[PDB]
């Protein structure tokens, strides 16, 4: 018999070693017969200006179709001959690329990904056929309404900023990005210092640094171009966003106040609260039992389709709040019930939800570490956002501090009266107006 | 609880049940409960051959005290014949509501 | 002997009790959306966007 | 280490656990249980079973079982399929004692009330019409009902003019003869055995047989169509091809990945799929092309699937059906197979990497054969498939008796004769 | 009907002189008021109840 | 498309060091939310007629 | 009865009181401007009443 104190004690650690170049190697065994393998990068939506801000969606269209050594499909051919996957994603803050495979092609898997990263070809004939694969899909994304209402949610936000912008950019830069253009992105935003090559499953530390050195040696760790550009960080601003169509058949809402950013401890007691909120959906088995209070409303009365909470951080910033979907005359109760919900936190928060709170906590932080893939994910972007990847026992000694009284000390200060950001998608004549949302921030009785 | 002398209880128990008179207006003891918000949910729980015959009880005792008329004395509701229809049904609704209140207590 | 889900098409539906109820072994029929326009069904009875990526600890 | 524990009771009834060291556990119980085994009379009665896992059953009420779950941050869970059911539950490791214990009274010992029966009979119309918004989903729902006449014909939804209508007793009728003892498989993955055989002695008490089992499955070519106005059309061509656990039923697995089955480079051109280049050779209009595949105890499907344009529907299935007569008349060569047999193995080994595929797996196989085998027993059979035997599978396609179902604006579909 | 015998029973004391017998029935049916409201109805309540069998 | 939309120009209305567009509010926070406001706080002295 | 005691309605009674004194001391405090109060006028001797 074991404990779950004990089975904390039995992770392997992650070895983290580093070439001349910089490049960072990272890894974890478990003794299975498939491994993941990928490179992060520090790259994203964030680092661009209004000049290209599609040009990192842009490259990871063209990573595999042709290489210097493998031209065309015949990176395709030699991916699906062994039975291997290659997927991509990009985001704001991140870019990574990774495969699947078994653990005896890792020494034909890493020369794949080291190939990719450094020599891909951006011809100018497949360039011209990517801008119309691009421009189709920005239109099945306005059917999508959430991915709509979040993009209203970060432009209306963070203004000013780089943060505002989206990760595909607009369609007139989709239409108009050059092949220098995406040369020029590539020599600035991979260089060896921003690249972390990690790897999860059945591999060894020792092998993989030799195959780091003899296939990532060529790149430069150095200061050419002597361009390291200052840092400048994000502000926060509440104001609103309101898009009225009475053709659609539900309308979608998002509010959010500003958080804490990466690195910032008070993200662990602001994750115990977001959890005493919760989630919901119309397929859920045992709503009007549910431990949470909003949640419980919602399916007695029908007055939502789905609501979530999220926590979005940043390096220096956050987004802090809630998501809902409901029909057109149920917009005023949802938003009392939700307000009235955040501020009875900021007081009156017992210790009894807390618990609930940090017992769901932990369970989704073992639950997201299940299989190569997502270890081999939290082992690369935590060594991009803290510096080192934090285990699974420094996890649990900052949720084990945690009372009511941080809880109700830490959620007044970011939420108590504050002004909120809020988007909506129609249709929306009964959302309320934004003194009658400003004034729902502060309590009555205390 | 008697078991010598409980030859008086029941002669008290029966005593009161005619000098209440609900059965002169042919009714059961369980039509003339008042409705609390537990009562309206046992009412709801209940099959519809036992419901309908509930309604047309309480309707014709309504329409009896319309004109100061009691029913004749061969269609009033006999003591060991009134029907404890709505008890079950309504012991399961408060033990519902006890064991809301002692996790809220949690 | 094999599943349904490692070498067969059917289906599997799935209900939970605190997340969202979902149905598939083969549905995505992938390499449909590098030919364009194939458009993200509309709800009228929400379902899961995500199928619950939030909350990752 | 301690690969697998494995355990047949006197009862029929298959246990099995493995000890790992992980902080998270995982439970799954596994029933012979699906849309097959109900005749015309209770069609839907095994949907209405899916939804009803936390209402009140006797030793915990419906508030007990969903305060008491989401008080440890617990999951349960519902998932079956045209032939199984499995109820699986989760959380950390010292919390497992007592989600363990709700288990076995959501599905030993449920109480089937009226009034809770009677509101759950709204939540059918809402969860088949968010299964239905898929055009997959009706699809093969209706291929099936083309194929068969009985036993496998039977939708995984319950049908429109049966909701309302499940009743109480209908649903105390489907445990009674079909939740039996040598039906049900018992799989733990981070607990250790003697618990898990000490768990299963609390419902020894009676079900304790065999159950009512399923007519056998009859073909019947048919051809199932279905005008409406979505914008692209589904259609799916098969034949009758082979149960699963034969010599046969290896050698479809390996054409399937002859043909194509799926992708591997996130926005890829296949280009080691023999089906999606014949076809696009004279398509040039957006399509999607595989190869199906369904196996079951006593029977299965094979063929093929495509998406397409109305107006190009005929051209797309015409293409996709000379290429599998190009493979049963001999042009098959030999390193196509070998690049075959390494997505079958590779596909095999990915799918065990989770806790949930891995639980998946062992449920399966103490179901359809009652014994447990090594990852390298089945790599070893999957190399033993030769080259006589791809070609006399697409033999058996081409000339078997055909089945058909459609959707979308069908004006220009073929008929299965034609 | 004693608490409407009661209300009656003061109407009659309250106008007669401060005197010997009108003083012991004033405050022993001032008492009698109170008595019947607080006390001995929600009493009586509850011996019905259990000859009604609840 | 909902990319090609941006919020407008807002910086003819906004307080006269939030037209710093570089920070991250910080500083710049609980600083500025009430030079319309402690006007109610001495109409509280002034409702008292 | 056993409908209203617990560790529920005194804990909610807990962060009340503060809530009840200042809801009570403002019925005291606030009584005594508007029907003239003259007897408490005199403990505060800052405020000229009247004239």
């Given at each position: 018999?074991?404990?779950?104190?004990?089975?904390?004690?039995?992770?392997?650690?992650?070895?983290?070693?580093?070439?001349?170049?910089?490049?960072?190697?990272?890894?974890?065994?478990?003794?299975?017969?498939?491994?993941?393998?990928?490179?992060?990068?520090?790259?994203?939506?964030?680092?661009?200006?209004?000049?290209?801000?599609?040009?990192?969606?842009?490259?990871?269209?063209?990573?595999?179709?042709?290489?210097?050594?493998?031209?065309?499909?015949?990176?395709?051919?030699?991916?699906?001959?062994?039975?291997?996957?290659?997927?991509?994603?990009?985001?704001?803050?991140?870019?990574?690329?990774?495969?699947?495979?078994?653990?005896?092609?890792?020494?034909?898997?890493?020369?794949?990904?080291?190939?990719?990263?450094?020599?891909?070809?951006?011809?100018?004939?497949?360039?011209?056929?990517?801008?119309?694969?691009?421009?189709?899909?920005?239109?099945?994304?306005?059917?999508?309404?959430?991915?709509?209402?979040?993009?209203?949610?970060?432009?209306?936000?963070?203004?000013?900023?780089?943060?505002?912008?989206?990760?595909?950019?607009?369609?007139?830069?989709?239409?108009?990005?050059?092949?220098?253009?995406?040369?020029?992105?590539?020599?600035?935003?991979?260089?060896?210092?921003?690249?972390?090559?990690?790897?999860?499953?059945?591999?060894?530390?020792?092998?993989?640094?030799?195959?780091?050195?003899?296939?990532?040696?060529?790149?430069?760790?150095?200061?050419?171009?002597?361009?390291?550009?200052?840092?400048?960080?994000?502000?926060?601003?509440?104001?609103?966003?309101?898009?009225?169509?009475?053709?659609?058949?539900?309308?979608?809402?998002?509010?959010?106040?500003?958080?804490?950013?990466?690195?910032?401890?008070?993200?662990?007691?602001?994750?115990?609260?977001?959890?005493?909120?919760?989630?919901?959906?119309?397929?859920?088995?045992?709503?009007?039992?549910?431990?949470?209070?909003?949640?419980?409303?919602?399916?007695?009365?029908?007055?939502?389709?789905?609501?979530?909470?999220?926590?979005?951080?940043?390096?220096?910033?956050?987004?802090?709040?809630?998501?809902?979907?409901?029909?057109?005359?149920?917009?005023?109760?949802?938003?009392?019930?939700?307000?009235?919900?955040?501020?009875?936190?900021?007081?009156?928060?017992?210790?009894?939800?807390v618990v609930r709170g940090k017992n769901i906590l932990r369970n989704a932080l073992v639950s997201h570490l299940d299989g190569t893939t997502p270890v081999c994910e939290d082992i690369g972007r935590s060594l991009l956002t803290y510096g080192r990847r934090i285990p699974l026992a420094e996890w649990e000694s900052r949720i084990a501090e945690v009372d009511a009284s941080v809880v109700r000390e830490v959620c007044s200060k970011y939420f108590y009266d504050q002004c909120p950001a809020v988007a909506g998608l129609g249709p929306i004549e009964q959302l309320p107006d934004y003194?009658?949302?400003?004034?729902?921030?502060?309590?009555?009785?205390? | 609880?008697?078991?010598?002398?409980?030859?008086?209880?029941?002669?008290?128990?029966?005593?009161?049940?005619?000098?209440?008179?609900?059965?002169?207006?042919?009714?059961?003891?369980?039509?003339?409960?008042?409705?609390?918000?537990?009562?309206?949910?046992?009412?709801?729980?209940?099959?519809?051959?036992?419901?309908?015959?509930?309604?047309?009880?309480?309707?014709?005792?309504?329409?009896?005290?319309?004109?100061?008329?009691?029913?004749?004395?061969?269609?009033?509701?006999?003591?060991?014949?009134?029907?404890?229809?709505?008890?079950?049904?309504?012991?399961?609704?408060?033990?519902?509501?006890?064991?809301?209140?002692?996790?809220?207590?949690? | 002997?094999?599943?349904?889900?490692?070498?067969?098409?059917?289906?599997?539906?799935?209900?939970?009790?605190?997340?969202?109820?979902?149905?598939?072994?083969?549905?995505?029929?992938?390499?449909?959306?590098?030919?364009?326009?194939?458009?993200?069904?509309?709800?009228?009875?929400?379902?899961?966007?995500?199928?619950?990526?939030?909350?990752?600890? | 280490?301690?690969?697998?524990?494995?355990?047949?009771?006197?009862?029929?009834?298959?246990?099995?656990?493995?000890?790992?060291?992980?902080?998270?556990?995982?439970?799954?119980?596994?029933?012979?249980?699906?849309?097959?085994?109900?005749?015309?009379?209770?069609?839907?009665?095994?949907?209405?079973?899916?939804?009803?896992?936390?209402?009140?059953?006797?030793?915990?009420?419906?508030?007990?079982?969903?305060?008491?779950?989401?008080?440890?941050?617990?999951?349960?869970?519902?998932?079956?399929?045209?032939?199984?059911?499995?109820?699986?539950?989760?959380?950390?490791?010292?919390?497992?004692?007592?989600?363990?214990?709700?288990?076995?009274?959501?599905?030993?010992?449920?109480?089937?009330?009226?009034?809770?029966?009677?509101?759950?009979?709204?939540?059918?119309?809402?969860?088949?019409?968010?299964?239905?918004?898929?055009?997959?989903?009706?699809?093969?729902?209706?291929?099936?009902?083309?194929?068969?006449?009985?036993?496998?014909?039977?939708?995984?939804?319950?049908?429109?003019?049966?909701?309302?209508?499940?009743?109480?007793?209908?649903?105390?009728?489907?445990?009674?003869?079909?939740?039996?003892?040598?039906?049900?498989?018992?799989?733990?993955?981070?607990?250790?055995?003697?618990?898990?055989?000490?768990?299963?002695?609390?419902?020894?008490?009676?079900?304790?047989?065999?159950?009512?089992?399923?007519?056998?499955?009859?073909?019947?070519?048919?051809?199932?169509?279905?005008?409406?106005?979505?914008?692209?059309?589904?259609?799916?061509?098969?034949?009758?091809?082979?149960?699963?656990?034969?010599?046969?039923?290896?050698?479809?697995?390996?054409?399937?990945?002859?043909?194509?089955?799926?992708?591997?480079?996130?926005?890829?051109?296949?280009?080691?799929?023999?089906?999606?280049?014949?076809?696009?050779?004279?398509?040039?209009?957006?399509?999607?092309?595989?190869?199906?595949?369904?196996?079951?105890?006593?029977?299965?499907?094979?063929?093929?699937?495509?998406?397409?344009?109305?107006?190009?529907?005929?051209?797309?299935?015409?293409?996709?059906?000379?290429?599998?007569?190009?493979?049963?008349?001999?042009?098959?060569?030999?390193?196509?197979?070998?690049?075959?047999?390494?997505?079958?193995?590779?596909?095999?080994?990915?799918?065990?990497?989770?806790?949930?595929?891995?639980?998946?797996?062992?449920?399966?196989?103490?179901?359809?054969?009652?014994?447990?085998?090594?990852?390298?027993?089945?790599?070893?059979?999957?190399?033993?498939?030769?080259?006589?035997?791809?070609?006399?599978?697409?033999?058996?396609?081409?000339?078997?008796?055909?089945?058909?179902?459609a959707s979308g604006n069908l004006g220009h579909t073929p008929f299965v004769d034609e | 009907w004693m608490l409407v015998a009661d209300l009656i029973t003061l109407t009659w004391i309250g106008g007669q002189p401060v005197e010997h017998p009108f003083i012991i029935i004033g405050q022993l049916a001032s008492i009698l008021y109170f008595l019947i409201i607080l006390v001995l109805m929600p009493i009586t309540s509850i011996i019905?109840?259990?000859?009604?069998?609840? | 498309?909902?990319?090609?939309?941006?919020?407008?120009?807002?910086?003819?209305?906004?307080?006269?060091?939030?037209?710093?567009?570089?920070?991250?509010?910080?500083?710049?926070?609980?600083?500025?939310?009430?030079?319309?406001?402690?006007?109610?706080?001495?109409?509280?002295?002034?409702?008292?007629? | 009865?056993?409908?209203?005691?617990?560790?529920?309605?005194?804990?909610?009674?807990?962060?009340?009181?503060?809530?009840?004194?200042?809801?009570?001391?403002?019925?005291?405090?606030?009584?005594?401007?508007?029907?003239?109060?003259?007897?408490?006028?005199?403990?505060?001797?800052?405020?000229?009443?009247?004239?």
């Open positions: 018999t074991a404990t779950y104190a004990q089975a904390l004690q039995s992770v392997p650690e992650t070895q983290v070693s580093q070439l001349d170049n910089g490049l960072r190697v990272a890894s974890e065994q478990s003794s299975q017969p498939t491994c993941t393998v990928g490179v992060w990068i520090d790259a994203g939506s964030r680092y661009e200006n209004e000049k290209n801000n599609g040009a990192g969606y842009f490259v990871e269209h063209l990573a595999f179709k042709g290489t210097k050594n493998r031209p065309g499909s015949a990176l395709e051919k030699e991916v699906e001959s062994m039975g291997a996957h290659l997927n991509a994603y990009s985001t704001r803050e991140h870019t990574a690329y990774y495969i699947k495979a078994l653990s005896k092609d890792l020494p034909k898997a890493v020369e794949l990904l080291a190939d990719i990263v450094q020599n891909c070809s951006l011809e100018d004939s497949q360039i011209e056929k990517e801008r119309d694969v691009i421009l189709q899909e920005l239109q099945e994304n306005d059917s999508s309404m959430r991915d709509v209402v979040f993009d209203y949610l970060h432009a209306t936000a963070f203004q000013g900023t780089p943060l505002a912008q989206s990760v595909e950019g607009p369609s007139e830069n989709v239409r108009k990005l050059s092949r220098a253009d995406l040369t020029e992105y590539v020599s600035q935003h991979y260089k060896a210092p921003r690249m972390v090559l990690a790897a999860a499953g059945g591999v060894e530390h020792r092998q993989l640094l030799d195959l780091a050195q003899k296939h990532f040696s060529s790149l430069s760790g150095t200061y050419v171009e002597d361009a390291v550009p200052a840092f400048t960080p994000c502000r926060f601003t509440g104001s609103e966003i309101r898009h009225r169509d009475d053709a659609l058949p539900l309308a979608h809402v998002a509010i959010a106040v500003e958080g804490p950013g990466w690195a910032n401890p008070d993200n662990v007691p602001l994750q115990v609260a977001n959890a005493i909120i919760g989630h919901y959906d119309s397929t859920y088995g045992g709503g009007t039992h549910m431990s949470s209070t909003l949640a419980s409303v919602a399916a007695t009365r029908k007055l939502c389709q789905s609501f979530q909470t999220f926590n979005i951080c940043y390096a220096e910033t956050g987004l802090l709040g809630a998501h809902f979907v409901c029909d057109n005359m149920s917009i005023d109760d949802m938003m009392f019930f939700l307000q009235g919900q955040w501020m009875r936190l900021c007081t009156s928060a017992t210790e009894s939800e003194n009658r949302i400003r004034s729902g921030m502060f309590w009555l009785r205390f | 609880a008697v078991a010598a002398s409980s030859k008086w209880l029941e002669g008290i128990r029966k005593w009161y049940y005619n000098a209440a008179g609900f059965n002169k207006l042919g009714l059961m003891r369980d039509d003339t409960i008042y409705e609390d918000d537990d009562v309206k949910e046992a009412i709801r729980r209940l099959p519809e051959n036992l419901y309908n015959d509930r309604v047309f009880r309480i309707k014709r005792a309504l329409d009896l005290t319309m004109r100061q008329q009691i029913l004749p004395k061969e269609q009033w509701t006999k003591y060991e014949e009134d029907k404890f229809y709505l008890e079950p049904y309504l012991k399961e609704v408060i033990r519902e509501r006890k064991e809301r209140e002692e996790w809220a207590k949690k | 002997m094999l599943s349904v889900a490692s070498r067969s098409g059917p289906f599997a539906p799935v209900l939970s009790a605190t997340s969202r109820g979902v149905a598939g072994a083969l549905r995505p029929l992938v390499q449909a959306a590098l030919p364009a326009t194939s458009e993200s069904p509309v709800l009228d009875a929400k379902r899961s966007f995500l199928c619950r990526e939030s909350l990752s600890g | 280490p301690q690969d697998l524990e494995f355990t047949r009771l006197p009862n029929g009834l298959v246990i099995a656990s493995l000890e790992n060291y992980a902080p998270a556990s995982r439970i799954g119980l596994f029933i012979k249980a699906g849309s097959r085994y109900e005749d015309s009379n209770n069609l839907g009665t095994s949907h209405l079973l899916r939804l009803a896992s936390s209402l009140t059953t006797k030793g915990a009420s419906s508030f007990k079982i969903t305060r008491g779950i989401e008080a440890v941050g617990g999951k349960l869970s519902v998932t079956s399929t045209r032939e199984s059911m499995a109820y699986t539950v989760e959380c950390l490791r010292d919390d497992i004692e007592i989600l363990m214990e709700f288990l076995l009274n959501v599905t030993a010992a449920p109480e089937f009330r009226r009034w809770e029966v009677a509101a759950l009979q709204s939540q059918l119309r809402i969860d088949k019409a968010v299964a239905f918004q898929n055009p997959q989903a009706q699809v093969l729902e209706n291929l099936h009902a083309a194929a068969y006449r009985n036993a496998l014909a039977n939708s995984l939804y319950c049908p429109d003019y049966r909701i309302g209508k499940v009743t109480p007793d209908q649903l105390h009728y489907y445990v009674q003869n079909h939740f039996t003892s040598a039906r049900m498989a018992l799989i733990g993955l981070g607990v250790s055995h003697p618990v898990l055989k000490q768990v299963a002695e609390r419902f020894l008490n009676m079900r304790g047989g065999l159950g009512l089992s399923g007519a056998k499955a009859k073909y019947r070519g048919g051809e199932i169509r279905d005008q409406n106005g979505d914008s692209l059309v589904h259609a799916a061509l098969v034949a009758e091809s082979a149960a699963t656990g034969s010599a046969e039923a290896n050698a479809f697995s390996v054409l399937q990945h002859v043909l194509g089955a799926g992708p591997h480079v996130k926005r890829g051109s296949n280009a080691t799929s023999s089906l999606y280049q014949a076809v696009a050779k004279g398509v040039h209009q957006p399509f999607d092309v595989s190869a199906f595949n369904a196996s079951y105890s006593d029977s299965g499907l094979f063929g093929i699937y495509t998406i397409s344009q109305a107006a190009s529907a005929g051209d797309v299935i015409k293409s996709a059906y000379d290429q599998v007569k190009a493979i049963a008349q001999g042009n098959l060569s030999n390193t196509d197979v070998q690049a075959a047999k390494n997505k079958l193995k590779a596909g095999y080994l990915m799918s065990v990497e989770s806790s949930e595929g891995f639980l998946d797996e062992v449920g399966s196989q103490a179901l359809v054969a009652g014994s447990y085998m090594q990852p390298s027993t089945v790599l070893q059979q999957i190399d033993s498939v030769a080259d006589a035997d791809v070609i006399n599978a697409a033999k058996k396609f081409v000339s078997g008796r055909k089945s058909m179902a | 019905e109840n259990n000859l009604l069998k609840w | 498309s909902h990319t090609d939309i941006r919020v407008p120009d807002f910086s003819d209305y906004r307080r006269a060091e939030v037209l710093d567009s570089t920070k991250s509010s910080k500083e710049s926070s609980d600083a500025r939310k009430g030079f319309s406001y402690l006007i109610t706080a001495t109409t509280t002295v002034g409702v008292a007629y | 009865l056993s409908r209203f005691l617990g560790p529920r309605y005194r804990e909610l009674a807990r962060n009340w009181i503060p809530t009840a004194s200042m809801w009570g001391a403002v019925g005291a405090v606030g009584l005594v401007w508007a029907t003239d109060w003259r007897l408490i006028l005199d403990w505060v001797p800052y405020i000229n009443g009247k004239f």
